[model samples]
Target: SKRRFSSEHPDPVETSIPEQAAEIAEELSKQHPLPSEEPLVHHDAGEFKGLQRHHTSAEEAQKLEDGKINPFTGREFTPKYVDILKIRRELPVHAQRDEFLKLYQNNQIMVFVGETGSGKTTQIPQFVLFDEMPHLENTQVACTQPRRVAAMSVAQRVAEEMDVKLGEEVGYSIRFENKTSNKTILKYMTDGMLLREAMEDHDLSRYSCIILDEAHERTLATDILMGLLKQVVKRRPDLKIIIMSATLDAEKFQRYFNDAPLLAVPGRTYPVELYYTPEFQRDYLDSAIRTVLQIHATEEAGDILLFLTGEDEIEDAVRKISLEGDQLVREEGCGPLSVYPLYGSLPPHQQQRIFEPAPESHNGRPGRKVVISTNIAETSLTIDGIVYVVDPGFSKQKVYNPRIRVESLLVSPISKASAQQRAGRAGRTRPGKCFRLYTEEAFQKELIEQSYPEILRSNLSSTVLELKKLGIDDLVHFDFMDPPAPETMMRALEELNYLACLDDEGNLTPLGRLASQFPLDPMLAVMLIGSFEFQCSQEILTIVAMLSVPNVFIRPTKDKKRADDAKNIFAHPDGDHITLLNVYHAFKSDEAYEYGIHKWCRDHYLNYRSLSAADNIRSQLERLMNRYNLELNTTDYESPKYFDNIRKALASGFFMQVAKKRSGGYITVKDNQDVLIHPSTVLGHDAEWVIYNEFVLTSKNYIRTVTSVRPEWLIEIAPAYYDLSNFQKGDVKLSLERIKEKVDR
Candidate 1:
């Protein structure tokens, strides 16, 4: 096995040219256009069944051949389906399948303005593969999603709808997983993934056409795709690309690409009457609950799908609804009801249970499914047999404030594309009704078509390095569909520099190049680098494991003795969550030998699967660090050593999250949010002794105090260092505050 592993290669691999052994020396002199440079701007809206594959591939091109079984299914299939009425009803302006074919037939560049729900993202690629441009089908038509879950789910949906088995005809690839096979015709990927794939195949010849979906979500990767895509177009003359979105902003996209031509497609949805809930005195939560009660009381029975922002709101809403349901008549005059919650974070089994239609035969009139979920349902998972919908109409998003060197997960408004995606859920099976829990007036006043652009909200240090590897040194004129704000971009650059991903002149440094190969967050990269510097790679490993896994500390379960018994295993005197995590790992043997870790985690309030995942992530990251030359210091293996390097690494990444002690167990953070160490952190009892200059909330009961920080990263990377102006003053007061006027008075 070792010899087998060693036999592979002496030369660098050119991953794109699959069939060829290697190119000769003379061929290296020419820089032919990347497949992305070739354009497939033409199209014809032939029915999915009549579409045919292209023949006589370019010398270096891969083309689809018409008349075949859907590869995955090994059964005869055709893109042109028997849905003529549906197709005719949804055809749009100037972009019929025939016109598209004509465009691709003549020109090499075109922009498609496809509407929501028209199957533009899925069907258009099929049209290109079989009907108009057969040259594309087998070559790989990759549809990029803004989110990973969406990528996986959509790929599966497309495969099933097309009568193909997953990973055969239609497959997907994402950060931690890959499912596409050699015979696959279509690949679904997240925007970041396709970009990474582009790094491996800059010209992207592997894919004949790339479809950018949900462009309105405006993630950093999608914006970069549009920008880098322009340069790609200039190089590959035969590759085709399609930009699809649920908005009216195609013109901006056109302008960004030198006014590329436009095509449009209307959606296919039966008219579903929409009713905005009447204005309520309370928040969307209360309004949604009251509306649910009212709808149940009067409207004909149908499954109700309620959308909230995140898990907390989902749980809170579910609890209240369950209580209300219990008190209501179960069946006409018969007795009670059940409530279930759904989201991306749910366990696989629980998720399946949500889709398993409610049990009938209580009164035998078909039990209505009342499911509460978060935005994970928006354009990601599809839950069938739903007829009634409840929408709170909000979602959570993260924005990195580089000035503070921190990332903030804040609740925000959903975009029009997102809202529309949510709205489509109602019409899935039969006639359905959606009760939007906002005033109709509020709906009209909200921003009609935009969500926070991905570039603006996330850390883009990795994206820049990715571009650097692809040969774009300066972005001065590299057009982004929607460029990030100057301050945000500036901060990303500084953090990368402090993290050693950049030099003084802002070019990618060696460390940065190595870091780019990894998909972890930049700070985590620094942490791994620290892991190599410190002898405690094992301990560093444990920390990574902690992050990858869910917390193991159990809550005070109803069974007091059992809960106390679980807590006795390494429960820290001080409450920090990480210490509890350490105690859990420390006591693993004891847990397995006698008390079950599963039941212990359960009786105590822990998710065993989460902890296991964290453990797996750490092992995988460690292996990756070794595969590169980023290894542990040889000297540290032989002797006892200070863990200063490890501490510094953690500090380098977390310096932005510094906090100062205040009275009453509360502290003001670098970002200005007041936080109290969760009741579980070992350091929660103390005013200081934090680690990484920040506090990561492991759970409600604990906050690990990070003292192993390298203070230099903050001073060098962030202006927020000024927030801790306390160190500059002479007097020191890290005491809890008590008012001068007391309750006794």
Candidate 2:
């Protein structure tokens, strides 16, 4: 039976919204039709009804009707996992299916332990949704995975395994993306998105049960949801909760749920052989290059998957390999090989390139594909035909500097689980080789068993907000698999306390309640609320959008002129990130929009699509803030408020990011470890003036100044303590002449 549809969902002729979505959605529906009650042998989408079944078709979902999911694939789709009949048939005769069923049958809450190849995540939900379970009354079951990509892939795989069309029995909900359709059973979603759903239904009332899959992944979103789930279990005793993980981290799960019985299931997979070479093991890229060369020397024609720390390194490796002639990289590795780089930040067309086989012209050639990528292409994205693996022991991780109070990314060693996960990539195609960049002894000695529980390392503002919203009075006492560091909790609490959202004892105050409603920092949320009076809601909204998004400037190390020239397209020379972003947003909507985002990005050397996405995220921030009664009134735009709130938000978010300049009219920092703000920022050339403020550390060698903190924000927030010696006294204000002098220099 199909779920109820909203009367509000409009037909074709709509009031507002861009045409790009409606235009594309119309195109996809024509290209692909939904599957009927007949079986079709689609490639990877065996049962996938394709675009005709759901609102989307880009190997995922369709576009939105409003700010939400479109009519076809919203809540109407109650998707389930793999089919129960198939599960039962596929279960090995010797398989201990009874033990798995018994564990869930006995406990309302169970910790399900299973391997990746196990039919746990993809099968358990169908068991709950379609099976005649004990507690399947008028309720739904929501399954959540840690990442959007995971949520999507898992959902699609489940639908395929069940021999049903995708989006019919299995669909997903992710950020600005969802593909649930009518007749959907188990709605798979990202953990954070599920939390967003839970915020609306605090008691978990929308679903009969909640299955937190990949609990071992331990992201910040997952940990926060875990805390919320603990509270939900206490408040709603009848709510069924199952936490599934590949690893055995059940001690905390048991302790939290009073020893919830754990159902461990083993899945069938080829045996993986592992080897470690510490001295021979070096950087993953260099080792991968050597491994590829070895494969070529051995004349083995198999796909190669190599992991790198980030996009920069992936591009670096790809560029180096792309230059090799007679490379067996393409269809036939016998000749000039083709190499493709895979990372999330690249455009869709580029991403699709990896999926293409080497050109048919080289059919007989020893063609092979080498995909160098970031973690994104790891688990969910199936780049088929990969037989050789190169596991770079490292991955890029966000490290928080509690001292300077900023987040920094570092390339660090991955957990043992992640290593195994990468190694498994090889086995996905054939009996393959996994070359560990580090020695086996080093892997055993220093490598962590699993990714660090995100809560322990992350800035716990999101967790704190979720707990408060759940009414978890004693968050510290809440159930967790691996409790976060006490300092992490207090650090978040302290931030909230400073924002006046929390009392000294860590209880949510009225302000705290508002803060919890927002998905960002409590302080930023408070600033957003206060800014509402200034009628600068749009401005504050843009700031949040910028804050929440990836930096838009195509900041390719020291490309100042390129950045400067592109300023006219979507920049506020006034030195404000908020306005600059707003300019991009407003400029994007112009129907006569002649400029190409990608081309514009290159010409101005800025990533326009990222800017657009940032703008999209800001709208989300605006909606979240609005839900908390923080809506800004445009009509009451006070002259000064537009100034103060923007600055205040910047002050709170980036106080530590503030820097001073050297005596030589350049920006030098005491704390930032020789890091310069990319020259694309509004204040990038104001180092001399920044120095006039007499900041703590001063030097002349710091080349100019750049700040995401807009000038208006600084002027509004900075105390009127004294004159800016450079600005008030000298030709620092007359920088055009200085530029000429510098050009002469």
Candidate 3:
């Protein structure tokens, strides 16, 4: 009676041939397992002994060190490999090799806790490679990271450590990028990417062992993956799982995995002295900058890491610190200082500069580097040689208001756990110090013990759809580490039901299964699917891709007027959605190439990186559409109704987000929240109705990325939401009622 194969329902009218084939494959695999291949016998048995599971003896280790052959690849070990092997042996995790093997062999699931610098992220997966020997078994080992950058970088590092080509033995799989090949035995990928793979392969049968790294962060995907793996272990006893974390949250993870054995490895970090301000400062930013300068002038030579909330704040601090640092060197005979800013959106090459050596000491004075960064450096990234940490005890965290169905980022106080994590960054290499701008009393009483997990604060519509596709019938009973709010869950289900992605009974409809295939929010996916019917799939695809990335328009502080003028050239009269499409079409034109695309983008005042990322996303999305037989048709650009068709297609998915102009402002249809059109909108004239991409809560309640639409299209595209009886008593309701009456005639 399970609905695990609902997508493959036998009803010929409902399921397609490809789906039936998948069902057949699933049934056949269960009835008869694939034949196992014969294990290869190595001529140098002593040297290969270390590759065997549950065998970690000194003699075997010595043989592996001296042996010329790489047992995993059957190639001669490179000199570089031997050099890295010596350093790998000195890692803290290396000392517990036998103990790890013992627990790993005895338990199907285990919990490992390793602090920063313990080499868990890079070494543990290799240990699993040696034990699982997945190449011989025709399977692979997967280690999941919370972020894509970590997966790619760690895989690259491990590839070098193992002396194999990146895509041959060790590789990474992230969204829009898959580096692994058939010969790959160790693959590092983001947790969300693994979840997507699991949707198609329910049991994750291709991986013999799965390692979920950074469990302490508790990302939304990681939480779901943990719950899914709990059930998967019962069905596939041969599958092994290792939940690795950096904090002392191992006990919780251990209990969640049915009391799995715990292994803790001490990190190689020196003691870091802590300092707290006598009183809380009213302006933490000023205090933070002053602390960095004080440390630069007084402290010994080493890099300093300062944590801020966002890019703007971090950049501002970096500029101020640089100016003051120069003054100190010129006026007070202080050390030379180099300042760098780190955030998620910074260019890759610029981000790498944070690791560069500090400025050289001059005139008998020391030199130092200062990196002002967002919370990304707290956990997702690690920088060595830091000796000072300036923490203002604040970060931008996302909070969801279920009543308004809005998610916004707010600068909030950091949790105690986050503060401790920040402090630990200073001690990664040597003894250091942490200067906290908040008083000790505020640290203890104001900050929570741990930040709320993302699951608790995020919009759950996409998650609910993903869960349904994963065959969890009753989400209320799912084994979540920390369950989301009931209201949030209800709102997600209601939204999906209205979108026709889910049935009244809370099961995934055909539309839901297809919507989950795209790596986007349910609304965006539904809109993409609905676009084909309107014959504007191509245009919608471009807009969807553009919307997925950051803003494409670049408005610099110094040249605001020039940038505005450049954007006006491509501005469409209808709305921002069409404007984005126009920008993409022009970018793809041959004229752009003739003029040098990069130079053309700069001339147009557009973000070249963002535009290129959108281009990459568009192609990937197009492939997915083709895979599912969604047409890529589009109306002729010159046709009068071409823009109208695109608008209707957008309305089909965002009918629930429609707003009506009333009393010199806008009011959301059902939510009844008053909002203003964001200053960045391209719509030149006021429209009676509009569809918004997002509701931004900043200085005011504003709806950004808006496009004009007719009320008639709302009734025709999504009658379920526009139905008059369900609406509340309000000006919006009255207007919609009048529109329905006129349409009835």
Candidate 4:
């Protein structure tokens, strides 16, 4: 049943406009009916029995007189949904919705700066929904979030607020789970997933309006979509684009979007008092532990959040804090403390244990929970009830050196922007305190204003492939919010050219098209495709899946030998890839399946989570290959050439990553940099030639996940990359010449 509508905005009266704009506005208005003109799709539950109003507007406040029932949920709308409506209407963003709709009606592009708690992520889309009438057109309004959890939970909350069944009128799309359906008119998805969608539909016509949330984060996907949408707006002028960000980076976006109209909404957050050390601390972990003890002793009953650099550091700090807190409890009669460690690599269930309530007070003492975490909590996850935050101002940031062609995780100082986010976490539940390990002078004078955008810090090979598939002809000239270095672009193009994903003239080839279809690195995708021709597609799939996930092998310091012994059972002298496949096979055996999978994994000392994710990835890849008609051919396990075929397939994708055996260690194929084989390799010390899947840049240059590959096979599988003229005069060049001649014969 539809609620009785009360007028909010005055009915439009004719207004004078210039001749040119009159025609344009008229055209746009014809495309979109005003809220009043669009037939009300909402129903009063009793009046519209068994009817579904897919498109509806609750923007105009209505009296809950007789038509008080929600047709969507078949529940009375007054008490629950109405209470939420009252709160929603009072949000800072809601005060400007009418003003927003005015600008949105006339402008093709708009910039929305909704600081944290502004309610813009959910409200702005609803405003667009009411105006666009997406359901009538069978289209959608897509709001993009950078993280999966935000996309999911926000969609659920919005569905409840809209008084509709979840996954009907509103839903979300992430990597594996797509909650959206045909009835979905407003969809929330990750920016990466939206980019994937644009691959199939470049114009992105499925969405009438695209709202990019948390855009100030400047993620890789958001940066690309802004560029793509800039072009898309010209193609589809009727479509609306809203660039939403929590930070005050408004002018940059405004200038990029041709000075798009800006709407800034202040966030609703309690004040957080900041504290700094009087003197610089040489050891941050020691300082962090001491601060936690201080809070537990003097502070009230509130949760504490401590930000550390990595898993090992966070784990250590958690232990140290527990020990120190116990000492305080005995001596000073302080509160009892519970500690939890948080990081991405931690198992999901274990990581989730951070949310468990504070320990019950012991012996009349108070209780508190302290969470020591990595940067995963900086922006990706949030834990409420954190009344105190400890920030050391460092995180594991991914840094890429174009010249060396290496991407490594470095423990680096975070920018002032990141510092503010960490501080904000403390104030989420109430007025809070933040203790900065560094002096105030360092935070004010040394830290950067914002972290480097991902584009500058990431390899663009996959991005280049995606752009090609998106029908972008000239990548160099393609409008990016922050353009990458010319050398970075060249590196990507050259890599794609080598993979045969892009032709020499810089166009997509058939192989590139197929490779782009899968959500994987260019090398992995090419390897999976090349597997079909090598007659070991099935085996290569297992290796690709295993390599795609985090390390599945587990070796605690106490159980290192036993875990090594267990892993060695599956080790193959040929290489790590074959050993990985053997491990996967054993994990999937009938006996292991009959036994509890979790217990079996524990017995084998394997990371059950990562292995299962790899299996899920394998299924997705298999389906994608089948969809693309890539034949899944495999040789018999007993065949003598089985491992040989798999190695050839591996070489097809890793030709550029191979290294030549030298008197010292190995010389990388491209730059001739000398490197050692990482200690974890199953391919022992004496391989004459090897192909490695990863390049590790640490105290020493190392090639990891190595396999013994014959030099001749490089010529056989990747003749183009093996061409002698492309290499500088050295042992590798001469060696390739000899291999080419041998393969020719």
Candidate 5:
């Protein structure tokens, strides 16, 4: 009964554009209909025709330059908007306006290559609006970004450039936020959000033109969207697509889209001189610091950027640089240097410090600001006046092991494209120089041409579920730009089948369709759905939300003892899952309110941002539950089986992640890998059976965020996965065999 409407109706003929529009209008009205008693008003055709869609003509350009009226909204342009346009015209992309429009007008699908500093992200969508004029056709144009911040911030900037209120004409839609209105003509959103919309609206008929920015990133969602759009364009020939990338990798994209025409726009940047080390350095971290100090002392005056691996390395480098910089100032009469660290986990206020100006020159010596950061600064951020960059040729990247079904981050060598991108950052503002810690020979011989796309490296259980929901019946035949490994595909199928999200034939079951509605992992989604049957949906909702966000417990370097003590206040003997629930309950209590929430968090050394984000996510998930008519009840807190019910529900979804305790450590049930409990876990004592949230592959193999459950619960909840018939003979199998015998009796 919950089947999609598009599945029931046959698609219109590809050549009949008007028929497609009529069908789309019918679908839109069915989804949101007007009042039956309301009367329709008719107006003359000549009432306020406004601006034409084709604005490339000389007459339209002249009127737009006059700035007397806003072409998009038929209102007066603000002086601020006019001033912004003056700067906008000087952008490198504007020089190719006529060229872009000529090609855009001629082709249905095109690939555009623009470098980092170019204005493609903000300018191209507006260019589409001037031509597509979606407002006249009662449609909109969508531009997809890989990151949420890019979508939201770019929409805000574009609204200013177009001289319109944000939600009125230009808007953004992200996962938990929608800023668009009925009047919006241009929408910016993450690629994943657009995929979600595609699940319901198969052809995406509401958008006349779709612009996919940063196609070179090859994010999981972008790759899926590329394949989906390839088929969608054939079904709706009236729709136009523009694949934008920041590199010279447009040929592959062009070929993927059936020999689409390519356009390259030059970016406004200065020349960057490259320097390589004479010999390879054993410790890149040590060499990175030395290179920064050398540049500060010898090179010309400018800010410096040093790319490191992760937060720990970045912070450590920052401290050492600051200490050594002070010594140089005190002993060698050199100017002072300010050091700042930037990474994903840092607070927003701290991130903003990287944008602050360099320190003032002292005693005729030029002071400098050094930003030691992760790869986020490589593309997502661009800081001006960086005259020097230090590249260590490494980054923390995710690699999934299908054999053990674990995804972990490992420090690995970066691709040649990534190295070049790091060098390009220095030339954003002026002619700069980049010092590489690796030798020239190593760079030419070692680094790969490009990094593997995320699809090739990720566990695809979630992607497989999304594909099934997208009506792709045969997973083996789906068109993928870079197909995942066969082993990876088999593991995903087996995992999903065990979850009962997919039937034995690989078709999406009713349970699978419902699970896809939530933007979460399959295990988390299944557990959420099963909570309704266990009478603990409310508590499970909180646990799932907390698990989705980053760890809420913060361990400060100086106050580790106090932080651990405070965390223990919320610890439950069973595991970290219940400990997180306790922390949330205390946070929402009246006592916490009287003590003040922020102050309470600071006193306890907890991450207030993560907890608050979890609260917001919980509200969103609760609304989804209510929409699906899933009961929202909790077992009485006083009942003896309250916690047991919650654990059983969790096991219902994660029975596959179970591990058996042994003499030395724990052995994963099926994969048979050795692992120990993460030191951060609050699980007071070892239990015979435990289900983990994640397997960490750092200095040692460990399972983090674990909760204990009964062997009986595992055998009872997921008999298919725990079946003894297919199990291998080992300690784990023997234990489960004994449990099955006892349960049968």
Candidate 6:
């Protein structure tokens, strides 16, 4: 929503408050405060002070005006830094720095809207740096991005501009990476990382000022942080919060923060003309393919960007486009085309190839490149040189079903906001065109203004647990920017209750607090805690860590058979759980370390990256266990009960996820829905009963990542969950009765 200046409300032209550097100096002289307006005379002779001082001396201030030295770094500004400074001054955001400072000083909270190429993401934090003077207060300034790559890349850019080392005055903290230490003052981190910190420090007292970037994206973590900050402001009146966005949902965000004032800055971008179809296109994928070809044949020299739903579709389209591109060169004297695929799952090194320049002209014609990608390109990253875009107006999104207790991915139409984002890609470098597969009427009448916030579309089990840990006594009464459905809340509560994480009174039990310590679902956490009793805590830790990361095993397109065969070499007849255990053991073996581990992983069709991530997660979990004083024991490999102990540990967490064999496939013991063993599972279709880690909805209902368990294990491990009174009378009930009879005998 753009607010235009009218006669009744003129644009802000000058500051209303006095810019009083003298008043602050006088106060500093009379009474020294926590953040005194005085610069460090000898910054290198640090008496426990951080990297930078709060203010500048008169001499240093003069040097700052000449771009000779950075007051924030207390160091001589390099030529490169001065060069960068000249470019930064021309940004639209630089023009409003004074206006922003005025509003920021007057209120505890403020909203800023800056579009792409506007420089807000990099420059706004530096402006706050000058005002907050975090080093003097012995605190830091933090900025949050929804994606890790953005946080990391922007941190590097800002570090160069400030004339400081990357990890000194500027740093980034993301999962598995923390680059800051006592010398750091400004930190860039993912929104999820800050949420984890809030778990330990409810008020987030480590930072003097916090900026939430891309708030209009409405990520689950961002939405929750907004609610948390709303309460924190009353407790910490001195703290400052800045919410920034490109979409400029200023009215909603301002109201959420008690009517915080807003400032807007225009972005520097070329015009992008949009083209719509004459009629409704039944198959968008086909239409997208045709449009890319037409643009290549008729359009001038420029790169092309095509949007698709997921990795599978992107892969298919890349091949189709490349083959057709080759035909154009031989048949019609068209230029050469280079096709690249971009998505979240591709290795970072491969994804970087999109930045490679377009191929040289072939046969005296101009060459072009086409990037087929998913929604990641729309916001998570940006690529230069793109002069045309093909928008099919759809993407894969997660939708939750409260009744079925499952979340599945679906291909759905995008919101109006998403359409604009896709089209803006072409306009980044120069004036371009956007071809929409749908008609203009459909875009106006059918597409919504904004995508549904993640809170409304996601399962809330973990969120509910986090709130309890945050000490929210009355969840129903707690405030949220966009409150989730009542059904979603009730479902999360009931699920936690059955897991024994919460008591009948809806308070966090000891188990719940311990489970909340780990960044995992309640079921997985409870299982890990219960593993202490099973005496296989170490093995259980490995399994849970593996499950936390992506799938470690890789199935290649040309050699999927060979990959499956290699996996079978480590397969245990019992089920997939033991198979995963076998793979982990092999990776940890002395032989694997002696040889080239990377090559070993390649030969076995396993992802070295995922396996390494699992190891890191395992280390984190172990530290948590040690901190909480939980037992970490392991069963002997020679012991006859070794495999049995592992099975019992798995049953501790997944007793509710078991399925019993029926005539065709397996029927879920709780829901009684028919399901087949997922193709990736090592367990054969004939298993009498199995405990699964996930239920996936695709071409068919399937259970994957399974382990076989005896019915007696469920009765012994999760007796409360297995209470017969809670179950309906069916084959599951009769089978349980027979098992209980045998145990009695």
Which of candidates 2 and 3 reaches a greater lDDT? Answer: 3
TM-score head-to-head 3 vs 6, winner: 3
My TM-score estimates for the predictions, one after another, are: 0.73, 0.70, 0.89, 0.85, 0.86, 0.84
Better model by lDDT, 2 or 6?
A: 6
The segments of candidate 6 whose C-alpha lies over 4 angstroms from its true place after superposition are 1-66, 276-298, 301-303, 308-342, 345-373, 437-449, 556-560, 590-599, 630-632, 682-686
For all candidates, what are the clash counts?
A: 58, 43, 0, 5, 0, 0
CA lDDT for candidate 2: 0.57
lDDT tens readout by residue for model 3, 7-106: 2122221322222322333354556654553332222334454356545544465566567887766689999889988977888888998788778888
**Which ten residues in a row are the worst by lDDT in model 2?**
10-19
Question: lDDT per residue, candidate 6, 32-145, as tens digits?
Answer: 333422331213323223223323232332245365546655667788887887777777787887677777777899999977667777888887776666766777888998
User: Model 1: residues >4 Å from true position, as ranges?
Assistant: 1-109, 131-138, 268-290, 293-297, 315-341, 346-364, 379-385, 399-405, 413-421, 427-431, 445-449, 548-598, 629-649, 652-689, 693-745
Q: Which of the two, 4 or 5, has more lDDT?
A: 5
Give per-residue lDDT, candidate 3, residue 550: 78
The local lDDT score (0 to 100) that residue 739 gets in candidate 6 is 84
Q: What is the TM-score ranking, best to worst?
A: 3, 5, 4, 6, 1, 2
Off by over 4 Å in 4: 1-68, 71-91, 163-166, 278-290, 309-384, 741-745
lDDT of 5 by residue, 1-745 (tens): 3322131221112211212222343454466654442221222243225555544543345356465767666677889988888877877888887788878878889999988767888888887776676766768899998866567667877899988888778988877567887778899999999998888678988899999988888899999999999999999978999999998667788888999999998776688999999997998898888889888888889999999987656867888999999998988878889999887556534666787899997667889999998887777546667888899999988888777777887899999999999999889778999998999998999999889899988999999998889999877778999988877887898888778777667887656777788888998988887786777889999999899887888786898898899998998876778998999988888998899999999898777878887888899999877655556789999999999988988887788888888844788886888888887764545488999999988767898889999988887677666667657878888888788778779
Model 6 residue pairs with clashes = none
What does the lDDT come to for candidate 5? 0.80
lDDT of 1 by residue, 376-434 (tens): 66654556667777777777777565554445566666766676677777776677788
TM-score of 2: 0.70
